[PDB]
Amino acid sequence: MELHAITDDSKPVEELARIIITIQNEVDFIHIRERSKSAADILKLLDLIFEGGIDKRKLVMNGRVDIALFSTIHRVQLPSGSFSPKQIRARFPHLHIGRSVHSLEEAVQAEKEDADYVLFGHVFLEGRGVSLLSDIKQRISIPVIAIGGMTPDRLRDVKQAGADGIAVMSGIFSSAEPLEAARRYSRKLKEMR
Amino acid sequence: MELHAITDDSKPVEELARIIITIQNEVDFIHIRERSKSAADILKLLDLIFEGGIDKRKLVMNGRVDIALFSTIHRVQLPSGSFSPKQIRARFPHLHIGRSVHSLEEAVQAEKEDADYVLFGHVFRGVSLLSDIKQRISIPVIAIGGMTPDRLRDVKQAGADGIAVMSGIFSSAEPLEAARRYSRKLKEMR
């Protein structure tokens, strides 16, 4: 089960860069989701972590396909209602494409549009999160990453539901000790393995 | 002299779409600069103006190069500190590239970096800087920042190849009438 860290769009680039560098070894991927920052600031953020030695292979750009292309980041997370995977793949075949879905229907269609995996959730949807998680895993063949209120105590349920991984935002980035927070998650996942 | 209308990043897409459709024939270009809206919302906006019958050739996407590419829009306006025109032309050679500059030095560097034109802003020492820039670079210069019909003469005389207007049009009670004052003045001087 993969562990995806999602940036929280609330810290200055310098502070966020340090946290990213600090937690990189406890997670599988880090999604850059600074929706309130300009491309200029996000490029500054990238430059800081690139110079900080981050492994670009773990980076995933949420929404800004342009920033991803000009930053040599080959992974993008497409929000619901934005670019279709098909049009993206037509121009940029090399990109690994994730789609953020919020229903069984959207998940299936995402698979049809050639997405590589879906980020499904805000599991914790009218309380249908965990059940839908199972329903999606049974209907599609691409990976399903669960997001939304993921805590160590809820991982077992998510795992039983068939989730191929979990995504965590505030659980890590709002913690007084981001590294220790990321570790509670990784420890819990390794345990259940 | 061209007239560029810049969206104001403060109205719902429905209302913004209406205004864009209404002023299209009074301006040469319309820059979508909804910096605080999501790609999904901007795409929704574009769908509305496209269905409203807009001339796509007039559209310029500010900042979101990805949205432009996937919306069949060939013109982009690059904010200071963002992508260099060289990187963009290397991958998307067909795009017409504008760079938003705020100093003489940035304007010169923009030309060296292969921009097609610059949007020099906040003229309203500003007109002096404009005049200076118009002698330093050979690519077109669009002046922005407090443009008003009464100030267009000085701007034109200083060499501006066009003027950009944001609030002067979009914050107006009657955007079309506002745009007309600029267009009428530009035709007048012509």
Q: Running DSSP on this structure, what letter comes out for residue B9?
A: S
How big is the CA angle at B78 (ends B73 and B84), to the nearest 5 degrees?
110
Phi, psi of A77 (to 5 degrees): -115, 115
CB B118 within 8 A of CB B107: yes
> What CATH number did the domain enclosing A25 receive?
3.20.20.70
Q: Which residues neighbour B110 within 8 Å (Cβ) at sequence distance 6 or greater?
A: B85, B99, B101, B118, B137, B139
Asked if A101 contacts A117 with a C-beta cutoff of 8 angstroms, the reply is no
CA distance A101 to A145: 10
Chain B residue numbers with beta carbons less than 8 Å from the beta carbon of A80 are 40
Nearest-CA distance A148 → chain B (Å): 20
Q: In this structure, what token pair is assigned to residue B15?
A: 């209302």
Residues in chain A, total: 193
Q: B57: helix, coil or strand? A: helix
Q: Which residues of A make CB contacts under 8 Å with B?
A: 35-36, 38-41, 43-44, 63-66, 69-70, 79-83, 87-88, 91
Which whole-number Å values give the CA distances from A124 to A127, A131, B31, B55, in the listed order? 7, 11, 40, 45
Contact assessment for residue B11 and residue B19, using Cβ atoms and an 8 Å cutoff: yes
Q: Do B46 and B34 meet the contact criterion of CB atoms below 8 Å apart?
A: no
CB A77 within 8 A of CB A96: no
- CB pairs below 8 Å between A and B: how many? 57
Any long-range contacts for B141-149 (C-beta under 8 Å, 24+ apart)?
B141/B107, B141/B117, B142/B2, B142/B4, B142/B98, B142/B117, B142/B118, B144/B4, B144/B6, B144/B119, B144/B120, B145/B121, B146/B122, B147/B123, B147/B182, B148/B124, B149/B181, B149/B182, B149/B184, B149/B185
Q: Is A169 annotated as a binding residue?
A: yes
For residue B150, count CB atoms less than 10 angstroms from its CB and return exposed for 0-12, middle for 13-18, buried for 19 or more: exposed
Instruction: Output the CA–CA distances (angstroms, integers) from residue A61 to A28, A94, A154, B84, in the order listed.
Output: 14, 14, 26, 19
Helix, strand, coil tally for chain B in percent (to 5): 45, 20, 35
- Burial classification of residue A57, based on how many CB atoms lie within 10 Å of its CB (0-12 exposed, 13-18 middle, 19 or more buried): exposed
Distance from CA of A185 to the nearest CA of B (A): 30
**Angle value at C-alpha B17, between B140 and B47, nearest 5 degrees:** 95
How many domains, in total, are found in chain A? 1
- Closest partner residue to A79 (CB to CB) among B38, B64, B88 is B38
- What residues make up the domain containing A88? 1-193
> A12 by DSSP, 3-state: which?
coil
* Tokens at B132, concatenated: 């200076």
Q: Which residues of A133-144 are buried (b: 16+ CB within 10 A; e: fewer)?
A: bebbbeebebbb
Question: Are A83 and B44 an interchain contact pair (Cβ–Cβ within 8 Å)?
Answer: no
**Maximum Cα interatomic distance, chain B, rounded to a whole number of Å:** 43
Q: Does residue B94 carry a catalytic annotation?
A: no
Q: How was this structure determined?
A: X-ray
Task: To the nearest 10°, report the CA torsion of A118, A70, B43, B179.
Answer: 170
Q: Rounded to an integer, what distance in angstroms lies between the CA atom of residue A28 and that of residue A111? A: 22
Cβ-based neighbours of B118, under 8 Å, separated by 6 or more: B98, B99, B100, B101, B107, B110, B111, B133, B137, B139, B140, B141, B142
String of DSSP letters for A82-145: S--HHHHHHH-TT-EEEEEE-SHHHHHHHHHTT-SEEEEE----TT-HHHHHHHHHHH--S-EE
SS3 letters for A144-184? EEEECCCCHHHHHHHHHCCCCEEEECHHHHCCCCHHHHHHH
Q: Reduced to 3 states, what is the DSSP secondary structure of residue A75?
A: strand
Q: Quote the CA–CA distance of A85 and B166 in Å, as a whole number.
A: 34
